[PDB]
Amino acid sequence: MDIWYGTAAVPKDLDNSAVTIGVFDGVHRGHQKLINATVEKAREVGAKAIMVTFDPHPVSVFLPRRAPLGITTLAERFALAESFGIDGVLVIDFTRELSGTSPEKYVEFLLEDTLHASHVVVGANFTFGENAAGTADSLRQICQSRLTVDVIDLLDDEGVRISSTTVREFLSEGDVARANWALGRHFYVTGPVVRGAGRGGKELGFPTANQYFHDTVALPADGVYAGWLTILPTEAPVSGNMEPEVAYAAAISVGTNPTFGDEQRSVESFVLDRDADLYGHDVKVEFVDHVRAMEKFDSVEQLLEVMAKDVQKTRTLLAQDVQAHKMAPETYFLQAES
Template sequence: MQIVRSLAELNSFPSPSVVSIGNFDGVHCGHRMVVASVIARAREIGARAAVVTFDPHPAHILHNTSRLPLITPLAEKLELLDQTGVDLALVLPFTEELRLWTARQFAERVLRDGLQAVEVHEGETFRFGHRAEAGIDSLSQIGRELGFLVRAYEPYILRGAAVSSSRIRTLVSTGELPQARALLGRSFSIHSTPASGRGYGTRYTVPTVNLAPYGDLLPAHGVYITTLRVGTGDQARVFRGVTNAGNRPTFGADSFAVETHLLDFEPIDLDETSPLEMTFLYRLRGEQRFPNPEALRAQIGLDVRRAQRYFTLCDALHVSLH
């Protein structure tokens, strides 16, 4: 997948396109349904399959009183879009200038002049332009004038409700991970590195890893069954674990951490730049304050045994953990 970060760069890649525009946060089942149709149609007519997304997420500019936690920060979003087979991703900087473009200006500059769109595929609730002035009907009318067709999609319904990034965000933030997995089409995961100042060396021999501070979406405070991928490519190692995401109230003052006890640990090469992917599978319990460290250790033993039973059952049923 080619990644283009400005309209000027598109001059190097002239080609008619079938396009979908969106934030694509999570690249969930609904997103992938539309992107698959874009790709199929592009292949049918000999065009390029393209997606348009934004950086930063428009909500970070339009609603700056509180930062929207992303399901998939940009790097992970682009990796997931690449896996769909789409040909090109146009990542537009969401600037004050772009925010003020009218719907027609956006269609002319991005769709007609930039991507040479012949078709645009969008959900029927799609809105664009300054103050979200235009919807799918306006896009269709503009398309007729500018020379592209518009295909609108009904919401992707799963378990009685439309699949959406906001719905997934709510499920993850309340710890309902199996439900979030159904909507994402994969288990929820985050990408990070080890926390600094923890003594990580060339050869790491302690079966506990803390993640660096993470600013996007995390599950509700509590204890989870997880996997941790260390490294990338063929050299990556995947460990099963039990992870506490929270403030560790037993130790007094708030000290938020995402801390994982690795169940099948073997010494590994690890430093503070090592790429980590934490996959959250199931919430064992909420955050608790224990009367003393001994009570905490006893509960951790129970958590570990429950996690081991979970993994044993998944192995027996050949259930994918990702």
């Protein structure tokens, strides 16, 4: 998959495309409808399926540091796009271009001159051009006799509107199960494992993995979750009895760091039935279900007691998740008991 930053980076010899346009944060089930529609048409006419997306978030251009939290990183947005059949992603920066353009010139410059599009696919909530003047209906009329337009209804399922907003709401509530249902996959984050408390191994109270994330990253509410930890493909040696590319059952503790930065987030993972230290590796953490709210501990005895209960409930939640094989990992480790 090609990745182009700005209209100038797009190849001049691009001959034909089917294009979908949006922020696409989270690549949720509604987004997948737009992408599938685009990929299907591109196949039919022998063109490239192209995603036009935005970075920074369009809201951040107007309200710096008050944009919505990133459901995924830009890098994972690219990976997800590719996984659903996108051939090229054009990343637009509204501080550089296409902000003060009329709807008419937006279609002329982006869809025609740049992308040579014969088809465009957008959601019913699509807007474009200076001061948001263009709507999905504007697009239909401007494109008359120039390219075909598919405006897809926003996705409603089980009485819920599936949008980036609703996914962020679910994550903020700690309802990862609903977030996952809307995403069509387990919500996950990926990052390097750093040093934390002790070293991972025989001690149940030392995390197997410690990770930290910036304040722009959407994470579930502080608390403990059932999930799966995967060491991403690597030839680097691994301390302990975990193999790369296997999803290991884990109790995952999400927290925040007080006094200096009221939003520096940590993810501490306690891998079930394993003795390992993952310092230095890139690790994916998929969230499955909420186990409990955060609590303060008065003794090691109490801490370890609650730890063991988290493991018990995690084991039950994950055993059930496997049966929803569709979101479950292909290769996984989960013992029937300790």
